[PDB]
Amino acid sequence: XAVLX
Amino acid sequence: XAVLX
Amino acid sequence: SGFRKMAFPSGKVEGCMVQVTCGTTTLNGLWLDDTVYCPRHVICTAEDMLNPNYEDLLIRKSNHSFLVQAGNVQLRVIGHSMQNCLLRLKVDTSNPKTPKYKFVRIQPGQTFSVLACYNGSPSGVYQCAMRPNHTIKGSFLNGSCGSVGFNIDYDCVSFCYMHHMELPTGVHAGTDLEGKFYGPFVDRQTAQAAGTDTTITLNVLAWLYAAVINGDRWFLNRFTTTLNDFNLVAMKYNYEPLTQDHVDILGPLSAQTGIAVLDMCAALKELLQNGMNGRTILGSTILEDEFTPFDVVRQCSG
Amino acid sequence: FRKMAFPSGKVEGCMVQVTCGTTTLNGLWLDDTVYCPRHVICTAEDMLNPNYEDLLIRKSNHSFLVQAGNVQLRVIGHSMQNCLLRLKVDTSNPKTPKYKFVRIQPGQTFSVLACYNGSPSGVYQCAMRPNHTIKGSFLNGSCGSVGFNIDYDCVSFCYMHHMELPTGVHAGTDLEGKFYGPFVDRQTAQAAGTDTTITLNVLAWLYAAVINGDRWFLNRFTTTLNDFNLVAMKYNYEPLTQDHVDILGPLSAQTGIAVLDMCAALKELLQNGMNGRTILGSTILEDEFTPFDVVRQCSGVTF
């Protein structure tokens, strides 16, 4: 759901 | 009415 | 004087941006004196991203596992360590463009300038506010990470933000320069979500004062309100509760325009309840909340 | 989709403070020349209608104090070029970036580094309005502040601030001292012509929206250039030309959406509003992002 940049 | 900066 | 959402000049920060690589992952790093700071996830691989054990991942690296480049020149890493969600890499050469700086953890509602970077190179600069729910409504593409948020007071750069990720809702999250996340987030690709967000009431009022010092008074009225009654309405519109400290912070601007804080609240109250009827304030059609009272008195004429 | 300005480090390295008598403002130091507004040779009551030519004669190199940081830059020459002064100094600026001077056209944008006493205070994005003014943010002592674009590694200087007009908008020159618009540097009665919305940029913004994945406003139809102008001109939009259509080519190609198809979509947006819906998180149609800015922001262009 969260994306590491 | 123009004002010089 | 006019009114723009301006960022601080970015030059002092540009001269600290470097590129940092580990394995096949590359992102941005901040080089001050003999230290480079970057998001610790630079050490992960594709399969580490879901449940990384940074501690376990790092012990398996050496100093030569990190490639830091300033432009096309390689900077040798002679030391490394993890501080919360950041990596502190010691390099054998010092950054002469290092400005006077300090690391500060800002408060929600506070504003700052971001220098979006890719591969250690500056792309653009924009100003934004730390949302009440700790997220940032920024503009980051992949490989942005490592980019930083900051404020400049005279010749001293106050670094307050470093980017780490995007949340499912399209907003962004990160840490201060000590590595502590702003908000209840962790640096791993797991289902995460920002908490409820509110409009920063203190900033909207600062902005309405900006419109007034700037010659616009159409939205004012003859009413007044109590702090309690103002909050009973503002909360209905998802606005941050206004405290007595907030009213004091507005003291300077209040005395400069001759409008009592509570009377300005009365005006805001009316705007919330009746919309703007097609009119605009400082050119805007909605109530703007990314200008702190400080930003207002700085950009506007005393 | 934030309104991003270009990283300003390169221009910050060219800003100096220029003082003539009691008048202090900002100067642009490139190689061994410092450019600043000519009105710096004017005093308090000498701005209603100054005779610059005769006012300069009474000046000598020693009349100008140029400071960079805390060091004084020695002026060994001075000449006037239209509305600017070109001061020759004995030191070539060590921070001179590769650069050029270009005259911007209506609708195009650039970044402004607002300065005071030679020290940069803020940077923001601006658009040269169709009426030849810019909606900027400047206080007293900001003049000589500069606007620019960066194309690759080359700094393109396109604006230098001189005045604020009665409507709260601003006017200035290119780096040749020529004014944008019909304005003159004298505190006479001058007014900006009425403005219009930069149609080209709005279309560009809609493309950015689509590129981002925000495409609900799109429709199944198209329109003629003429039919679009008839509608757009009610909402006070600048007439769209074929040249504009062609400038939008790269974006149209990136999204596969013909310009006249987006115009059909824009048309419907003007006659029916947004229904409380939002485009790129905005409730209004942005007109200060050019097809280039759009390409720049969505492509992660660096410098």
Numbering used by the authors:
A (entry chain D), B (entry chain C): 1 to 5
C (entry chain B): 1 to 302
D (entry chain A): 3 to 305
What does the publication say?
The pivotal roles played by Mpros in controlling viral replication and transcription through extensive processing of replicase polyproteins, together with the absence of closely related cellular homologues, identify the Mpro as a potentially important target for antiviral drug design. CoV main proteases (Mpros), which are key enzymes in viral gene expression and replication, were revealed to share a highly conservative substrate-recognition pocket by comparison of four crystal structures and a homology model representing all three genetic clusters of the genus Coronavirus. The substrate-binding pockets located in a cleft between domains I and II, and especially the S4, S2, and S1 are highly conserved among CoV Mpros suggesting the possibility for wide-spectrum inhibitor design targeting this region in the Mpros of all CoVs.
From this round of modification, two inhibitors designated as N1 and N9, and a more efficacious derivative named N3, were identified with fast in vitro inactivation of all CoV Mpros tested, including those of TGEV, HCoV-229E, FIPV, HCoV-NL63 (representatives from group I); MHV, HCoV-HKU1 (representatives from group II); SARS-CoV (related to group II); and IBV (representative from group III) in preliminary inhibition assays. (C) Surface representation of SARS-CoV Mpro (blue) in complex with N3 (green). These results demonstrate that N3 is a particularly promising lead compound for further development.
